[PDB]
Amino acid sequence: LSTASVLAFERKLDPSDALMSAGAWAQRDASQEWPAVTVREKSVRGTISNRLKTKDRDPAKLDASIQSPNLQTVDVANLPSDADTLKVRFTLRVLGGAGTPSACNDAAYRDKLLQTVATYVNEQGFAELARRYAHNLANARFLWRNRVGAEAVEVRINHIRQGEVARTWRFDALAIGLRDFKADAELDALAELIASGLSGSGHVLLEVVAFARIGDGQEVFPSQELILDKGQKSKTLYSVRDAAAIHSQKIGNALRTIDTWYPDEDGLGPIAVEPYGSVTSQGKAYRQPKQKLDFYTLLDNWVLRDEAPAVEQQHYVIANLIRGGVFGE
Amino acid sequence: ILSTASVLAFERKLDPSDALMSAGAWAQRDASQEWPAVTVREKSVRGTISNRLKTKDRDPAKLDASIQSPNLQTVDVANLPSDADTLKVRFTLRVLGGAGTPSACNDAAYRDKLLQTVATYVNEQGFAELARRYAHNLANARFLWRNRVGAEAVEVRINHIRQGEVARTWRFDALAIGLRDFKADAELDALAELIASGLSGSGHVLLEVVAFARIGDGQEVFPSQELILDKGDKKGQKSKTLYSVRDAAAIHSQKIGNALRTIDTWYPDEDGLGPIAVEPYGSVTSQGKAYRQPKQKLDFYTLLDNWVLRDEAPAVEQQHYVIANLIRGGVFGEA
């Protein structure tokens, strides 16, 4: 029994592109004809603020660089000057059947993996992972920079069973912190819904609408595209039919920020679950493969050598299975 | 040991909005919610050569030929209406806090050393000097860049807006508070206390700033200018574009943010010229000159490397300057 050459998992927890719109606070219950936040252009003039390479540190060359500055065109998105509340809306889809790979080579390997994740579900349910996912939906972690320094954030989550709303949740996203995981009756009811979606015992579709009270005319932060060349424009923002938007993978990276079991520390907070679970903002790999706590060595110990790791690392490897990916040689 | 990080980035504090312009009459300043916006129009401009000639006195017939074929352009222009004499410029500004925390860092030891360094900075003295200078730059209407030059009366109204309604109101005469020196006043120090409470993370600060400048009937106001690159040659008629949020003349938010952080009075050249905007190698484009050159040991990068890596704490003025540059934010790294 060895690991297969190919192994692929399609993702559960499918989000949509989060669209932005704007309005006034206390009109948020009538926030259906709220106008879309548009992306405009403006001109910026740069200054010299980089570190110099000790050869451009001569005063004449520095002053000559101050003489001729660069001019750029930059995409920008703001709230309207009469609106103070940003509305960000997306849909999440929880499917279930997380253990079954969409591609596999060895039949013994996939059957061993299936009974491994089957015993994982039988030992305990999805309640820990779905509780942490309901926490990351409760606080507005999917408002990445739009949440930083907000006055009041409020999340409305709607379970949509048929073509209408089956159930509603109303969260104060600043009360639910970003650091720890609490216990709440409405949050655990939402967690039970997400767990029943994850266990294959139901098809879960949610509509998540977050309202951030930022201020009149303040800048919002949609997702940012990629520029390969210029000749002019130096920053592009993501947009879906003339409305500022956040990428679906940005929302998905904010959803699975649940990993509190990395070997480095625990006072930093949760990170996103990844193989060699890493953050690009810090440029450093937590869960290095030299330590015995990355995803691949844990999976090869649990499935091949039958070494069941600790139950929080079991939560980590099953969260990586829910994330999906391309595993193999 | 303990080298600086290869990538390091700080998001800005003191976020301003775009400053929108409207026009009205003085002493209607308290009813200035239905004031109409200042619009941007186009006009034709015929001019002749008033620049220096490249070949000075060696071609007079070329000069006469260039005067017989003058420059025709189309220029964006923004005036007050002929029955209103007061420009009203409105924006919002939020003070956040968490000034030392970088939004990106490579070395964990470097960011822990930086965090404890700025923690000792806050512990020795507050943000009170920096917030006093920021409240001064809000008190005088320095964000009216050329709209304040030669104004008869400038008046600034600052609303601290806690919930959806106003929590406190300040009212300043911006011509009394000079552009030169930093004084003391009870209302100004109360505003400085609010800005410092926002800067420390002990509160959420959102302010609405409205300036009224008494310029004159029909006089010209000055919004921000857009980029007109590679359109001045083929036809070349449109030669000046003014920035506008939808059908309203506006100032860029980075121009307001440059006027807010004009606080640096500690640069080694002199101080008789006045405060400049805080910047690494603190430089003015209109003078074409960098104060705080890196050959002197008073720019931002050498001061930060001495304060963080080698624990050489500079003077309290240079510490004010380094923390002001951390409040400003930027991309600081090996480029």
XYZ file of C-alpha atoms in Angstrom:
664
model
C 0.000 0.000 0.000
C 1.619 3.188 -1.298
C 0.319 6.629 -2.214
C -1.189 6.886 -5.683
C 0.528 8.823 -8.450
C -2.508 11.052 -9.030
C -5.007 12.209 -6.406
C -7.377 15.147 -6.770
C -10.103 16.597 -4.556
C -12.691 19.061 -5.752
C -13.460 21.671 -3.137
C -16.397 21.799 -0.818
C -17.464 25.263 0.439
C -17.823 26.928 -2.954
C -18.190 30.722 -2.649
C -19.275 33.179 -5.322
C -17.643 36.464 -6.243
C -18.551 38.948 -3.529
C -20.172 42.010 -5.084
C -20.008 45.470 -3.527
C -22.723 48.095 -3.219
C -23.290 51.097 -1.006
C -25.953 52.744 1.076
C -26.830 54.376 4.357
C -26.918 52.670 7.733
C -30.418 51.801 9.049
C -31.554 51.382 5.436
C -29.794 48.011 5.366
C -33.051 46.093 5.753
C -34.134 47.689 2.456
C -30.707 47.097 0.894
C -31.839 45.473 -2.331
C -31.794 48.397 -4.772
C -28.539 49.711 -3.325
C -26.381 51.019 -6.188
C -23.180 49.239 -7.100
C -19.805 50.623 -6.077
C -18.055 51.574 -9.299
C -14.330 51.533 -10.032
C -12.954 54.824 -11.331
C -9.522 56.032 -12.351
C -7.443 58.826 -10.914
C -3.955 60.201 -11.386
C -1.232 59.829 -8.790
C 2.173 61.463 -8.755
C 4.823 59.399 -7.059
C 7.768 60.434 -4.955
C 11.090 58.762 -4.207
C 10.604 56.638 -1.102
C 12.443 53.388 -1.822
C 15.734 52.417 -0.270
C 18.668 53.508 -2.406
C 21.432 51.141 -3.483
C 24.265 53.341 -2.005
C 25.258 54.423 -5.552
C 22.120 56.487 -6.143
C 22.662 57.921 -2.648
C 24.604 60.867 -4.082
C 22.806 64.170 -3.369
C 22.829 65.479 -6.949
C 21.267 62.315 -8.387
C 18.736 62.243 -5.543
C 17.724 65.863 -6.159
C 17.498 65.191 -9.903
C 15.183 62.284 -9.102
C 13.079 64.675 -7.011
C 12.927 66.969 -10.083
C 11.121 64.525 -12.392
C 8.462 62.385 -10.684
C 6.521 59.476 -12.102
C 2.887 59.881 -13.121
C 0.469 56.964 -12.938
C -3.182 56.158 -13.512
C -4.619 54.097 -10.671
C -7.982 52.396 -10.258
C -9.825 53.409 -7.102
C -13.147 52.542 -5.491
C -14.882 54.753 -2.950
C -18.223 54.969 -1.275
C -20.505 57.749 -2.505
C -20.227 60.959 -0.522
C -23.754 60.545 0.892
C -23.441 56.825 1.729
C -21.520 55.493 4.719
C -22.160 51.727 4.628
C -20.577 49.163 2.311
C -22.635 46.076 1.466
C -20.774 42.955 0.340
C -22.844 40.011 -0.879
C -21.962 36.480 -1.966
C -23.361 32.947 -1.958
C -21.736 29.921 -0.324
C -22.430 26.302 -1.268
C -21.737 23.452 1.172
C -21.919 20.062 -0.538
C -20.566 17.170 1.537
C -18.828 13.954 0.636
C -15.424 15.409 1.416
C -13.432 12.173 1.526
C -14.087 10.934 -2.000
C -11.377 12.012 -4.468
C -12.279 13.025 -7.999
C -9.222 11.190 -9.370
C -7.184 8.292 -7.977
C -4.905 5.537 -9.275
C -4.620 2.792 -6.642
C -7.909 1.189 -5.623
C -6.477 0.060 -2.283
C -5.293 3.610 -1.564
C -8.677 5.219 -2.237
C -10.529 2.506 -0.298
C -8.139 2.919 2.645
C -8.603 6.698 2.475
C -12.384 6.283 2.337
C -12.488 4.104 5.433
C -9.991 6.434 7.155
C -12.234 9.454 6.665
C -15.239 7.243 7.467
C -13.736 6.438 10.861
C -12.966 10.161 11.199
C -16.670 10.973 10.806
C -17.637 8.132 13.158
C -15.249 9.218 15.938
C -16.595 12.769 15.926
C -18.784 14.717 13.551
C -17.951 17.796 11.512
C -18.955 20.006 14.456
C -15.489 21.419 15.170
C -14.738 22.344 11.553
C -18.262 23.612 10.907
C -18.134 25.566 14.172
C -14.943 27.285 13.039
C -16.416 27.916 9.568
C -19.516 29.414 11.185
C -17.194 31.583 13.272
C -15.358 32.809 10.166
C -18.748 33.593 8.641
C -19.915 35.296 11.848
C -17.056 37.744 12.053
C -16.455 39.441 8.721
C -13.073 37.963 7.931
C -14.067 38.049 4.249
C -13.998 41.845 4.486
C -10.225 41.895 4.301
C -9.261 45.562 4.571
C -12.833 46.879 4.551
C -13.217 45.532 8.096
C -10.054 47.179 9.452
C -11.119 50.240 11.400
C -14.838 49.943 10.747
C -17.311 51.452 13.183
C -19.798 48.572 13.134
C -19.957 45.427 11.007
C -23.119 43.328 10.794
C -23.506 40.033 8.926
C -26.797 38.614 7.647
C -26.636 34.932 6.693
C -29.571 33.262 4.952
C -30.066 29.541 4.520
C -31.912 29.303 1.203
C -33.511 25.855 0.900
C -36.046 26.299 -1.904
C -36.243 29.490 -3.985
C -36.943 31.510 -0.805
C -35.266 32.040 2.556
C -35.409 29.090 4.928
C -33.593 30.641 7.880
C -31.825 33.844 8.929
C -28.881 34.632 11.194
C -27.974 38.148 12.347
C -24.478 38.633 13.761
C -22.581 41.584 15.185
C -19.257 40.801 13.534
C -17.204 42.986 15.872
C -18.456 41.141 18.961
C -17.280 37.832 17.508
C -13.545 38.459 17.511
C -10.928 37.278 15.061
C -8.729 35.701 17.760
C -10.643 33.025 19.679
C -13.607 30.737 19.076
C -16.606 31.262 21.354
C -19.891 29.439 21.996
C -23.282 30.821 20.974
C -26.690 29.262 20.361
C -27.323 30.896 16.972
C -23.710 30.286 15.946
C -23.963 26.618 16.908
C -27.263 26.307 15.033
C -25.505 27.692 11.952
C -22.645 25.284 12.691
C -25.117 22.393 12.785
C -26.444 23.507 9.396
C -22.922 23.669 7.932
C -22.093 20.278 9.471
C -25.229 18.689 8.009
C -24.197 20.113 4.655
C -20.670 18.754 5.093
C -21.836 15.294 6.196
C -23.767 14.723 2.966
C -27.078 14.805 4.870
C -28.262 17.949 3.092
C -27.518 20.451 0.355
C -26.631 23.792 1.944
C -26.825 27.105 0.092
C -26.223 30.302 2.049
C -26.417 33.963 1.104
C -23.993 36.088 3.122
C -24.447 39.869 3.154
C -22.084 41.975 5.266
C -22.634 45.643 6.111
C -19.575 47.641 7.150
C -20.088 51.147 8.535
C -16.983 52.874 7.195
C -17.858 56.512 6.554
C -19.027 58.955 3.894
C -16.932 58.755 0.750
C -14.283 56.519 2.287
C -12.180 54.170 0.196
C -13.174 50.535 -0.114
C -10.845 47.726 -1.172
C -12.021 45.265 -3.825
C -9.855 42.533 -5.267
C -6.882 43.545 -7.371
C -5.939 42.217 -10.794
C -2.535 41.567 -12.364
C -0.653 43.869 -14.741
C 2.096 42.477 -16.949
C 3.040 45.629 -18.870
C 2.375 49.349 -19.131
C 3.144 52.151 -21.553
C 0.014 54.676 -17.857
C -2.170 52.310 -15.833
C -0.404 50.762 -12.845
C -3.245 49.307 -10.740
C -6.377 47.426 -11.813
C -9.310 46.418 -9.623
C -11.566 43.419 -10.130
C -15.061 44.109 -11.423
C -18.049 42.054 -12.581
C -20.352 44.050 -14.907
C -19.337 47.533 -13.677
C -19.503 46.642 -9.987
C -16.498 46.402 -7.691
C -15.952 42.840 -6.559
C -13.787 40.528 -4.486
C -12.393 37.317 -5.967
C -14.020 34.061 -4.903
C -10.674 32.621 -3.816
C -10.176 35.637 -1.537
C -13.451 34.841 0.247
C -12.464 31.176 0.322
C -9.086 31.988 1.845
C -10.861 34.040 4.476
C -13.300 31.203 5.217
C -10.792 28.438 5.995
C -8.656 30.621 8.302
C -9.272 28.168 11.127
C -5.907 26.461 11.693
C -4.955 27.114 15.323
C -2.758 24.007 15.630
C 0.475 24.985 13.924
C 3.600 24.047 15.921
C 5.102 27.550 16.084
C 2.706 29.364 18.420
C -0.953 29.922 19.220
C -1.115 33.584 20.283
C -0.740 34.784 16.700
C -4.162 33.470 15.708
C -5.666 31.134 13.125
C -4.151 30.788 9.672
C -5.612 29.336 6.501
C -5.363 25.575 6.102
C -2.774 24.703 3.447
C -0.279 21.925 2.761
C 2.767 23.269 4.596
C 0.321 25.787 6.021
C 1.794 29.124 5.121
C 1.012 32.819 4.898
C 2.180 35.036 2.050
C 1.908 38.171 4.188
C 4.656 36.855 6.461
C 6.580 34.925 3.800
C 7.157 32.027 6.186
C 5.984 28.424 6.325
C 4.341 27.281 9.459
C 4.147 23.462 9.481
C 7.491 22.860 7.797
C 8.131 19.305 6.534
C 11.206 19.086 8.791
C 8.783 19.201 11.673
C 6.404 16.256 11.583
C 3.273 18.369 11.229
C 2.694 19.244 7.566
C -0.221 17.836 5.585
C 1.606 15.257 3.471
C 3.512 13.442 6.223
C 0.369 13.435 8.374
C -1.684 11.918 5.550
C 0.986 9.318 4.779
C 1.160 8.395 8.460
C -2.616 8.170 8.863
C -3.367 6.202 5.700
C -0.294 4.111 4.859
C 1.340 3.442 8.234
C -2.005 3.743 10.129
C -0.537 6.254 12.603
C -3.551 8.270 13.679
C -2.294 11.730 14.712
C -3.724 13.934 17.446
C -7.355 14.906 17.000
C -6.648 18.562 16.225
C -4.173 17.484 13.542
C -6.917 15.174 12.317
C -9.093 18.297 12.096
C -6.277 19.951 10.117
C -5.875 17.139 7.570
C -9.641 16.784 7.069
C -9.845 20.572 6.636
C -7.209 20.220 3.914
C -9.423 17.558 2.343
C -12.366 19.984 2.425
C -10.139 22.656 0.839
C -9.305 20.384 -2.095
C -6.157 20.349 -4.143
C -3.790 18.292 -6.257
C -1.894 15.711 -4.205
C 0.569 13.192 -5.564
C 3.728 12.782 -7.563
C 22.395 39.134 13.512
C 18.976 40.881 13.384
C 19.028 42.264 9.868
C 16.203 44.305 8.392
C 13.356 42.567 6.599
C 13.484 42.133 2.840
C 9.796 42.990 2.462
C 8.037 45.354 4.858
C 4.877 47.356 4.243
C 2.673 49.633 6.334
C -0.900 50.525 5.516
C -1.628 54.188 6.024
C -3.317 55.730 9.009
C -5.285 58.990 8.685
C -7.262 57.958 5.609
C -8.929 60.965 3.951
C -11.683 60.893 1.364
C -11.796 62.882 -1.855
C -12.542 66.510 -1.040
C -15.608 67.700 -2.938
C -16.178 71.339 -3.864
C -19.409 73.316 -3.739
C -20.225 77.008 -3.851
C -22.426 79.327 -1.870
C -22.744 82.615 -0.047
C -20.983 83.557 3.164
C -23.261 83.600 6.254
C -25.240 80.823 4.553
C -22.497 78.499 5.805
C -24.794 76.873 8.362
C -27.372 75.999 5.686
C -24.657 74.601 3.406
C -26.138 71.178 2.745
C -27.966 72.055 -0.480
C -25.092 74.074 -1.898
C -24.596 73.243 -5.588
C -21.387 71.614 -6.734
C -18.657 73.498 -8.559
C -18.680 72.170 -12.105
C -15.770 71.785 -14.515
C -16.135 73.495 -17.890
C -14.019 73.819 -21.017
C -12.721 76.971 -22.639
C -10.473 77.845 -25.555
C -7.074 79.391 -24.868
C -4.922 81.106 -27.480
C -1.424 81.928 -26.308
C 2.022 82.694 -27.651
C 5.578 81.756 -26.709
C 6.389 83.185 -23.282
C 8.983 80.526 -22.469
C 12.724 80.819 -22.882
C 14.020 80.290 -26.394
C 16.509 77.486 -26.933
C 18.498 79.564 -29.419
C 18.221 82.882 -27.601
C 18.924 85.775 -29.972
C 19.896 83.893 -33.125
C 16.490 83.607 -34.857
C 14.102 86.569 -34.728
C 12.187 85.550 -37.851
C 11.457 82.199 -36.205
C 10.037 84.137 -33.265
C 7.819 86.251 -35.539
C 6.705 83.126 -37.406
C 5.786 81.415 -34.136
C 3.792 84.479 -33.083
C 1.956 84.407 -36.411
C 0.933 80.787 -35.637
C -0.047 80.837 -31.959
C -0.853 77.916 -29.685
C -4.542 76.981 -29.567
C -5.665 74.748 -26.709
C -8.765 73.623 -24.854
C -8.458 73.896 -21.077
C -10.606 72.596 -18.229
C -11.549 75.374 -15.825
C -13.478 75.582 -12.559
C -14.945 78.806 -11.198
C -17.461 79.782 -8.608
C -20.773 81.040 -9.989
C -21.053 84.782 -10.456
C -23.522 85.126 -7.550
C -21.577 83.116 -4.946
C -18.334 84.061 -3.215
C -17.610 81.139 -0.866
C -16.026 77.813 -1.761
C -16.984 74.896 0.484
C -14.626 71.921 0.478
C -15.835 68.835 2.327
C -14.194 65.513 3.115
C -14.118 62.842 5.808
C -11.068 61.543 7.652
C -10.840 58.470 9.860
C -8.094 57.831 12.408
C -7.547 54.129 13.042
C -4.626 53.218 15.302
C -2.226 50.310 15.320
C 0.577 52.402 13.900
C 3.577 50.139 14.410
C 2.107 46.918 13.048
C 3.301 46.153 9.505
C 0.951 44.669 6.954
C 3.807 42.495 5.642
C 7.133 41.403 7.128
C 9.648 38.674 6.358
C 11.644 38.323 9.586
C 9.653 37.583 12.731
C 12.459 38.825 14.982
C 12.543 42.123 13.086
C 8.828 42.735 13.500
C 8.931 41.781 17.188
C 11.812 44.221 17.703
C 9.885 46.878 15.761
C 6.701 46.239 17.750
C 8.466 46.535 21.088
C 10.319 49.643 19.858
C 7.089 51.421 18.973
C 5.591 50.092 22.223
C 8.368 51.828 24.152
C 7.740 54.921 22.009
C 4.070 55.024 23.043
C 5.028 54.275 26.653
C 7.525 57.152 26.934
C 5.139 59.724 25.471
C 1.800 59.388 23.740
C 0.807 60.392 20.255
C 0.125 63.860 21.666
C 2.793 65.787 19.752
C 1.959 64.134 16.423
C -1.774 64.499 17.011
C -1.269 68.135 18.019
C 0.509 68.811 14.733
C -2.163 66.904 12.772
C -4.910 68.852 14.546
C -3.031 72.026 13.646
C -2.948 71.002 9.980
C -6.684 70.370 10.198
C -7.217 73.663 12.051
C -5.562 75.797 9.428
C -7.025 74.846 6.064
C -3.785 73.674 4.510
C -5.795 71.173 2.457
C -7.037 74.216 0.549
C -3.775 74.397 -1.351
C -4.278 77.319 -3.722
C -7.881 78.011 -2.700
C -6.542 79.476 0.553
C -3.975 81.789 -1.064
C -5.363 85.302 -0.907
C -8.597 84.283 0.779
C -10.506 86.917 2.716
C -11.739 84.557 5.430
C -11.215 80.829 5.955
C -13.311 78.896 8.464
C -13.047 75.196 9.327
C -15.825 73.092 10.874
C -14.836 69.688 12.257
C -17.525 67.220 13.324
C -16.615 64.170 15.369
C -19.287 61.693 14.307
C -19.614 58.816 16.778
C -22.893 57.178 15.769
C -24.823 58.270 12.670
C -25.101 61.735 14.273
C -22.476 64.290 15.260
C -20.842 63.836 18.669
C -18.761 67.017 18.868
C -18.194 70.170 16.809
C -15.098 72.352 16.528
C -15.084 75.723 14.763
C -11.785 77.368 13.847
C -10.714 80.507 12.026
C -7.980 79.075 9.825
C -6.340 82.446 9.172
C -5.601 82.917 12.879
C -3.864 79.540 13.181
C -0.845 80.197 11.005
C 0.844 77.936 8.506
C 4.167 78.603 10.265
C 4.112 77.682 13.956
C 2.359 75.258 16.299
C 0.502 77.033 19.121
C -1.698 75.889 22.018
C -5.454 76.243 22.489
C -8.081 74.393 24.511
C -10.253 73.369 21.548
C -7.161 72.486 19.519
C -5.746 70.325 22.307
C -9.136 68.638 22.744
C -9.117 67.808 19.029
C -5.519 66.623 19.463
C -6.653 64.383 22.322
C -9.308 62.880 20.051
C -6.782 62.297 17.249
C -4.319 60.741 19.707
C -7.042 58.482 21.115
C -7.735 57.341 17.574
C -4.026 56.851 16.897
C -3.497 54.745 20.027
C -6.230 52.235 19.221
C -8.326 53.220 22.242
C -11.127 54.532 20.032
C -12.518 54.761 16.522
C -12.168 58.273 15.115
C -14.248 59.526 12.194
C -14.268 63.251 11.435
C -16.060 65.365 8.858
C -14.059 68.420 7.794
C -15.764 71.300 5.981
C -13.817 74.399 4.968
C -15.313 77.689 3.806
C -13.036 80.041 1.880
C -14.244 83.532 0.970
C -12.639 84.082 -2.429
C -14.976 86.281 -4.455
C -17.832 86.174 -6.948
C -17.001 84.110 -10.007
C -13.358 83.609 -9.070
C -11.371 80.551 -10.094
C -10.951 77.585 -7.783
C -8.300 74.892 -8.168
C -9.183 71.194 -8.103
C -6.671 68.446 -8.745
C -5.305 67.962 -12.249
C -5.516 64.651 -14.073
C -3.038 63.026 -16.444
C -3.109 64.051 -20.093
C -0.148 62.006 -21.319
C 0.204 61.246 -25.059
C -2.668 63.524 -26.090
C -0.791 66.815 -26.564
C 0.829 66.101 -29.941
C -1.508 64.611 -32.585
C -4.364 67.079 -32.100
C -3.143 68.538 -28.815
C -6.159 70.721 -28.152
C -7.183 69.309 -24.768
C -4.211 70.297 -22.632
C -5.521 70.357 -19.051
C -7.937 68.024 -17.264
C -9.374 68.650 -13.805
C -10.290 65.806 -11.472
C -13.950 65.279 -10.706
C -16.070 62.834 -8.764
C -19.409 62.717 -10.580
C -20.127 66.207 -11.986
C -18.312 67.878 -9.069
C -14.831 69.391 -8.974
C -12.705 67.572 -6.432
C -9.278 67.343 -4.842
C -7.465 64.005 -4.791
C -7.354 62.218 -1.456
C -3.570 61.924 -1.565
C -3.334 65.711 -1.904
C -5.357 66.099 1.305
C -3.159 63.467 2.923
C -0.064 65.371 1.853
C -1.476 68.521 3.398
C -2.260 66.705 6.651
C 1.230 65.351 7.353
C 3.029 68.672 6.731
C 4.413 68.463 10.257
C 8.161 67.879 9.885
C 9.933 70.810 11.550
C 13.055 68.823 12.476
C 14.977 68.622 9.210
C 18.704 69.439 9.426
C 18.754 72.230 6.824
C 16.881 74.848 8.870
C 13.508 75.529 10.436
C 12.946 79.111 9.260
C 11.316 77.795 6.082
C 8.549 75.944 7.916
C 7.175 72.418 8.198
C 7.383 69.971 5.317
C 5.523 66.751 4.631
C 7.021 63.671 6.250
C 8.759 61.397 3.749
C 11.828 59.158 3.611
C 14.501 61.594 2.435
C 11.985 64.320 3.204
C 11.715 66.166 -0.050
C 9.663 68.879 -1.704
C 8.927 68.662 -5.410
C 8.358 72.405 -5.845
C 11.851 73.072 -4.515
C 13.415 70.072 -6.263
C 15.481 69.381 -3.168
C 15.682 66.582 -0.634
C 16.045 67.620 2.928
C 17.231 64.734 5.132
C 19.715 63.426 2.597
C 21.107 59.941 3.337
C 24.647 61.360 3.398
C 23.566 63.101 6.566
C 22.385 60.706 9.250
C 18.852 62.061 9.483
C 16.673 60.343 6.867
C 14.036 57.785 7.813
C 15.888 54.614 6.848
C 19.123 55.162 8.772
C 17.160 56.416 11.789
C 14.930 53.334 11.745
C 17.892 50.993 11.287
C 19.731 52.637 14.182
C 16.667 52.608 16.428
C 15.651 49.020 15.657
C 18.769 47.016 14.821
C 21.464 48.713 16.908
C 19.126 50.184 19.592
C 20.485 53.722 19.089
C 17.420 55.714 20.041
C 17.579 59.129 18.335
C 16.359 62.456 19.687
C 12.682 62.775 20.586
C 12.118 64.963 17.515
C 13.609 62.305 15.252
C 11.512 59.693 17.047
C 8.460 61.851 16.294
C 9.556 61.921 12.641
C 10.068 58.141 12.420
C 6.687 57.411 13.996
C 5.087 59.979 11.674
C 6.563 58.096 8.722
C 5.166 54.864 10.130
C 1.767 56.556 10.420
C 2.104 57.689 6.792
C 2.721 54.117 5.631
C 4.629 52.926 2.624
C 6.660 50.189 0.995
C 9.967 49.958 2.870
C 12.278 47.263 1.595
C 15.317 46.206 -0.369
C 14.682 47.742 -3.788
